[PDB]
């Protein structure tokens, strides 16, 4: 039977298409963040060249972070952190100025968030929070949304982790940017993305995939579910919870950016890795569809 080969090719292509969809979602947010970081660095340069004073600058940044978050209802939070005195050399003047995005040490450390689109509240991140290395569900340090682009000089897409919005703990990922001046990192900017958005993405793609007869899952590099059309209760959970026998193999395939098909009863599984942004560690889509659907009516 040459039936099995056509079923494999179809699912491989479906796996590729689903990865394109997830990649586009991440890349749209990456575009938006990259464009806004230029606005941040320009304002910083206007103040460095004394065309703009520090009080107006910190006010301007604080307002424009909020406006840029309000403009993208796909984004959960927007944070901006500068190294000490690296925004304007004037941190000492803004100690405990949260209405100007300045924290307990005057460092410009600003967050705007919208738990639902439009309920914009703000926080100035204190030093102990910027330095909190507590391990999360993936093993990664809590403050990787700050230290990751600062250490590499490159953007990062964190594994799912819990963070505070309002006074609730939400499960999320972030696209975090280094703010570089002449090849040196002077600060960090980042977009927070509610994992419920990726859960919706995996459900919507499953509906378009043979009328939802199978399932679509989204895997972060560390192997946490960022989306699972069959059970949202798997958000933030390790792949071994749903796929113990192949968890280990699936994760090394993922990290090596290798695709693979799996035969199981009369169902097919495909793991399709994907880079969410350029150079990022591969995420993946896991697709399972019964063979009878692939060789459909
Ligand atoms: N969500 C990562 C940025 C942040 C703001 N407040 C706490 N953490």
Numbering used by the authors: 48 to 344
What does the report in the manuscript say about this coordinate set?
Here, we report that the opportunistic human pathogen Pseudomonas aeruginosa exhibits chemotaxis toward histamine. This chemotactic response is mediated by the concerted action of the TlpQ, PctA, and PctC chemoreceptors, which display differing sensitivities to histamine. TlpQ is the first bacterial histamine receptor to be described and greatly differs from human histamine receptors, indicating that eukaryotes and bacteria have pursued different strategies for histamine recognition. High sensitivity histamine responses are mediated by the TlpQ chemoreceptor, which binds histamine directly.
To determine the molecular determinants for histamine recognition by TlpQ, we solved the high-resolution structure of TlpQ-LBD in complex with histamine. There are four monomers in the asymmetric unit,and the superimposition of their Cα atoms resulted in root mean square deviation (RMSD) values of 0.4 to 0.8 Å, indicative of high similarity. An inspection of the structure revealed that it is a dCACHE domain. A long N-terminal helix is followed by two globular α/β modules, termed membrane-proximal and membrane-distal modules. The membrane-distal module contained bound histamine in all four monomers of the asymmetric unit. Of all the homologous domains that we identified, TlpQ-LBD was the largest, at 334 amino acids, namely due to particularly long inserts between β-strands 1 and 2, extended helices α1 and α2, and an extended loop between helices η3 and α3. TlpQ ligands are present as protonated polycations at neutral pH, which explains why the ligand binding pocket is highly negatively charged. TlpQ ligands contain at least one primary amino group, and the primary amino group of histamine plays a central role in binding because it forms hydrogen bonds with the side chains of Tyr208, Asp210, and Asp239. In addition, this histamine amino group interacts with a water molecule coordinated by the main chain oxygen of Lys211 and the hydroxyl group of Tyr158. Each of the histamine imidazole nitrogen atoms forms hydrogen bonds with Asp210 and Glu170.
